[PDB]
Amino acid sequence: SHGLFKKLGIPGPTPLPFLGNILSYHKGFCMFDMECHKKYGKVWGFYDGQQPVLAITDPDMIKTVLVKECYSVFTNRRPFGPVGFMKSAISIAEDEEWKRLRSLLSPTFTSGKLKEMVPIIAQYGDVLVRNLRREAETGKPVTLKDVFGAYSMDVITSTSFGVNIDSLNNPQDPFVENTKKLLRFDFLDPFFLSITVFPFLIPILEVLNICVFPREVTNFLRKSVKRMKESRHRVDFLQLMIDSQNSHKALSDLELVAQSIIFIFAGYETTSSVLSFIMYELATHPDVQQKLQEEIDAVLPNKAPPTYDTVLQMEYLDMVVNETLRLFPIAMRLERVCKKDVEINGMFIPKGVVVMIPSYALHRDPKYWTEPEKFLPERFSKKNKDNIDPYIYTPFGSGPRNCIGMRFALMNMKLALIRVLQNFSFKPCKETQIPLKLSLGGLLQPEKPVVLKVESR
Amino acid sequence: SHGLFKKLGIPGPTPLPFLGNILSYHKGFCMFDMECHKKYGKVWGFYDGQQPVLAITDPDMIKTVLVKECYSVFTNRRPFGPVGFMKSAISIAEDEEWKRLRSLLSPTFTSGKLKEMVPIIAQYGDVLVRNLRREAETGKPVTLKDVFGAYSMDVITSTSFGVNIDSPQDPFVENTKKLLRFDFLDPFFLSITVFPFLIPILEVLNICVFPREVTNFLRKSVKRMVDFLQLMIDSQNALSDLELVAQSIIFIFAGYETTSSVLSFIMYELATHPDVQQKLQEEIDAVLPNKAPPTYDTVLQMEYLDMVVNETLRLFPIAMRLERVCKKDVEINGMFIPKGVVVMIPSYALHRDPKYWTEPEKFLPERFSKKNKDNIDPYIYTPFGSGPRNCIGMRFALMNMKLALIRVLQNFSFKPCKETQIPLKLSLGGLLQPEKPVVLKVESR
Ligand code: HEM
Numbered sequence: 001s002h003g004l005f006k007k008l009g010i011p012g013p014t015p016l017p018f019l020g021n022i023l024s025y026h027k028g029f030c031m032f033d034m035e036c037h038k039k040y041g042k043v044w045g046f047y048d049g050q051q052p053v054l055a056i057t058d059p060d061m062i063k064t065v066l067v068k069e070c071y072s073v074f075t076n077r078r079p080f081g082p083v084g085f086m087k088s089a090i091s092i093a094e095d096e097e098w099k100r101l102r103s104l105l106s107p108t109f110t111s112g113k114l115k116e117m118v119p120i121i122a123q124y125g126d127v128l129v130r131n132l133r134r135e136a137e138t139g140k141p142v143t144l145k146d147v148f149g150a151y152s153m154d155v156i157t158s159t160s161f162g163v164n165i166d167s168l169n170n171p172q173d174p175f176v177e178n179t180k181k182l183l184r185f186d187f188l189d190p191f192f193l194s195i196t197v198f199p200f201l202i203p204i205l206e207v208l209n210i211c212v213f214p215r216e217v218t219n220f221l222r223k224s225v226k227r228m229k230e231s232r233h234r235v236d237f238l239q240l241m242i243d244s245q246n247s248h249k250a251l252s253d254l255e256l257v258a259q260s261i262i263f264i265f266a267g268y269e270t271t272s273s274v275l276s277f278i279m280y281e282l283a284t285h286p287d288v289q290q291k292l293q294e295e296i297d298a299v300l301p302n303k304a305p306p307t308y309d310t311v312l313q314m315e316y317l318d319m320v321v322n323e324t325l326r327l328f329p330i331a332m333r334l335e336r337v338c339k340k341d342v343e344i345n346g347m348f349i350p351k352g353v354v355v356m357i358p359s360y361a362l363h364r365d366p367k368y369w370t371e372p373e374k375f376l377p378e379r380f381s382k383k384n385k386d387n388i389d390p391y392i393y394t395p396f397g398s399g400p401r402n403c404i405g406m407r408f409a410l411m412n413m414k415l416a417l418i419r420v421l422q423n424f425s426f427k428p429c430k431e432t433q434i435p436l437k438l439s440l441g442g443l444l445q446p447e448k449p450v451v452l453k454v455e456s457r
Numbered sequence: 458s459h460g461l462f463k464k465l466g467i468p469g470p471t472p473l474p475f476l477g478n479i480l481s482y483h484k485g486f487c488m489f490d491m492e493c494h495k496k497y498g499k500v501w502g503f504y505d506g507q508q509p510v511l512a513i514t515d516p517d518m519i520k521t522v523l524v525k526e527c528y529s530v531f532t533n534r535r536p537f538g539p540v541g542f543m544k545s546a547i548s549i550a551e552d553e554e555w556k557r558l559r560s561l562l563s564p565t566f567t568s569g570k571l572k573e574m575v576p577i578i579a580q581y582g583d584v585l586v587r588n589l590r591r592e593a594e595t596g597k598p599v600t601l602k603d604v605f606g607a608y609s610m611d612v613i614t615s616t617s618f619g620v621n622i623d624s625p626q627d628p629f630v631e632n633t634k635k636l637l638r639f640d641f642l643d644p645f646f647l648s649i650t651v652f653p654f655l656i657p658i659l660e661v662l663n664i665c666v667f668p669r670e671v672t673n674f675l676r677k678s679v680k681r682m683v684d685f686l687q688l689m690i691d692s693q694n695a696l697s698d699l700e701l702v703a704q705s706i707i708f709i710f711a712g713y714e715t716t717s718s719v720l721s722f723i724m725y726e727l728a729t730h731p732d733v734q735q736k737l738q739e740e741i742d743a744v745l746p747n748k749a750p751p752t753y754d755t756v757l758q759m760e761y762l763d764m765v766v767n768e769t770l771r772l773f774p775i776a777m778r779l780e781r782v783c784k785k786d787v788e789i790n791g792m793f794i795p796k797g798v799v800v801m802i803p804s805y806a807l808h809r810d811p812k813y814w815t816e817p818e819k820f821l822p823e824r825f826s827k828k829n830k831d832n833i834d835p836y837i838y839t840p841f842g843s844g845p846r847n848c849i850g851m852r853f854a855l856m857n858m859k860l861a862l863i864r865v866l867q868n869f870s871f872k873p874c875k876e877t878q879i880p881l882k883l884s885l886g887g888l889l890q891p892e893k894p895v896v897l898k899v900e901s902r
Pocket residue numbers: 066090091092102262263264266267268270271274330331334335394395396397398400401402403404405406408409
């Protein structure tokens with residue numbers, strides 16, 4: 001199968017036997033995708049072992065894969081295992097089981113169900129400040145993901161279930177301590193390597209009850225959801241799963257935990273990591289931070305409480321969040337498995353090929369963005385948003401399988417940014433790694449953690 | 458009793474004695490609420506005779522009335538009589554009777570019972586195309602609500618009872634269309650609303666607003682006819698045989714009149730916006746190639762079709778207003794509302810507010826796109842109401858209408874007919890309808 005892209009006349013790096021091109025990942029997915037886009041142009045192919053991966057960068061073709069031909073051709077992502085009972089998780093589900101679950105979990109993030117969560121998040125916004133004030137009253141660096149990680153946990157545990165689990169901290173909370181080591185795709189680990197480079201050992205590992213999420217983490221979270229599921233008010237992610245489990249049919253008990261673990265993860269890890277990138281950029285661009293602070297005070301004078309409506313009114317904040325996501329799309333890539341032979345936009349694609357959208361590369365392509373390395377929130381002004389293509393800039397994906405928690409993620413991060421910049425300013429402190437080095441490993445994180453100085457206003 | 462809104466400091470137009478403000482309805486309910494929305498902003502109160510009506514536009518206040526404090530304070534709509542045996546209908550009943558019926562008829566539109574009706578509807582979707590093709594191969598302008606109203610009668614008499622009858626001169630469509638005619642210049646509907654203190658005179662006199670021998674053509678037909686009918690006989694074996702017919706009168710009128718009128722409102726906008734009709738015709742051929750028959754699932758995938766239906770129902774909300782009767786003194790969202798006031802949600806005026814809609818008069822299905830769907834408050838756009846007393850057939854109507862719209866744009870395109878009223882003039886009468894009947898030229902593909 002290593003002669004596939006030569007057959008189709010599609011350029012790409014020459015693959016080694018067995019390994020394919022995975023050796024080229026020594027700088028990470030992101031540097032590999034940039035170089036290949038520069039070397040080969042609009043379309044190229046490579047192999048993750050024996051798995052052909054076709055990378056597409058054309059906006060029309062991307063819309064076909066992500067939106068037009070989703071339900072019929074590009075329905076699922078690259079198979080990820082061994083996962084055990086977590087195969088029922090929405091992000092991992094396939095075909096009919098995914099359609100069932102997506103529809104069932106959509107009503108969790110309506111503008112009505114979101115509006116109902118601002119007062120709940122309004123509790124832990126003030127808590128995030130009080131923990132910040134302590135580290136501010138005394139000259140000392142502040143690791144942001146710890147304090148952002150704590151905030152995220154409280155926000156996902158109470159809006160989806162109704163359970164306050166972090167009493168002002170309580171910094172050694174078992175939820176965060178177990179959830180951070182939930183999945184760490186270390187490519188140096190022979191495990192995630194051999195899974196990718198020889199993706200036929202999953203069935204063995206599955207019958208051996210081996211899982212990519214450690215057992216004590218899955219157990220602790222599994223015990224807790226059974227401890228949370230009693231419910232004997234407001235309809236929440238726990239209620240939407242329980243009212244329909246009580247009523248084809250239906251939602252299982254090991255399935256109801258699976259969706260909770262997915263939500264519990266993304267709510268904690270994705271939110272806190274993007275919040276760190278933002279604050280790093282504001283601290284390294286004081287003009288942008290002052291301008292954002294100037295906007296927050298105009299919309300919310302006297303440190304007014306942020307509301308659902310006032311969050312959406314702030315134009316510069318939305319630009320700051322978007323430009324950061326442009327530079328740091330935490331998904332790095334978007335993938336879809338081609339389930340049958342298709343010829344999209346005049347290009348034949350055979351069954352079984354994974355179609356990959358190099359999001360990180362597209363977000364930094366000079367042919368789409370001026371000075372793509374520079375942090376310029378003005379790209380996303382309404383004056384300039386004409387020249388921004390929704391299929392080049394896809395930080396939450398696109399189409400029927402985009403980020404289901406997008407609106408929740410943006411509001412939770414915006415509510416956090418408002419109540420923080422309302423009370424503090426952020427300066428570098430030399431131990432701040434400048435410029436920021438990105439983790440040359442699997443997921444999108446920095447090398448050294450983000451540490452900043454916090455001053456009170 | 459006319460100095461109420463003056464006491465509470467709530468703005469409003471001055472009431473004439475006995476009449477109140479009902480002389481401003483000469484332009485219809487819709488134009489009155491919009492005039493009031495501009496002059497008296499946010500909240501105002503007027504009078505329907507001796508009946509004070511508080512019009513609220515704040516979406517949080519709308520949510521309190523429609524959802525939060527529904528079961529408690531705002532359970533019942535405005536009193537409507539004389540009704541007779543029709544007092545037992547779900548839309549007219551109150552409190553306890555409403556609760557037992559709202560739960561009883563809710564299983565009619567579960568995701569299961571609603572998927573059972575797809576092969577029942579898919580038969581009449583070919584008689585509609587075969588009847589339009591006789592008037593399309595000939596260059597004859599088609600009156601849309603006629604051929605539509607026929608399709609709406611079959612679907613409701615076969616998804617609720619299981620009897621195939623309609624489709625031309627059908628006795629059901631004939632008696633159903635004249636079931637109620639709220640002409641506001643008829644001295645009947647005017648007075649009993651303005652001077653309602655004579656309603657119980659007509660109630661003890663066995664008088665009713667619905668025609669006697671129109672209620673009889675439908676009272677004996679149900680005695681003649683798992684679906685909607687079956688779901689009620691199983692609980693009957695305290696549902697009486699009089700309250701049973703009351704519900705069939707509701708489902709048949711709604712399933713016929715409400716479906717046909719909106720579909721005509723849809724077809725009018727698609728003809729006036731060819732770039733919208735063509736863009737919708739290209740989406741139906743992609744999810745359903747070779748004119749593939751539409752199923753339950755292929756309907757929910759079509760996004761533009763939903764954004765067209767939602768933009769029409771924004772423009773033409775056939776209910777115009779939502780109403781709840783405040784049953785005790787309350788102070789909701791920082792405002793005293795006494796007992797007996799009718800709280801009114803001006804659905805038509807809200808669906809065209811420039812504060813919530815840009816270029817509202819213009820038809821743009823792009824307001825409901827997933828990118829712009831975020832900007833839509835679910836208490837400003839409430840074409841089916843909201844809360845525990847919303848439209849029970851909303852999920853049924855949203856599917857049934859979309860089932861009709863798909864089987865038509867696969868075979869025919871629609872152009873104006875010169876005699877088509879452009880722009881469409883709304884009926885300055887009572888209900889929401891066009892003045893002249895909608896007519897369009899039908900060209901086959
Ligand atoms: C800054 C924060 C976040 C970003 C940038 C982000 C990004 C993404 C991306 C790129 C995808 C895949 C889209 C595609 O394949 O086209 C996705 C999917 C998903 N996201 Fe997020 N996400 C964030 C936070 C969250 C949160 C807070 C939740 C809470 C539940 C969440 C839940 C999910 C789920 C369940 C999926 C799977 C979608 C499916 O398969 O149906 N994400 N997200």
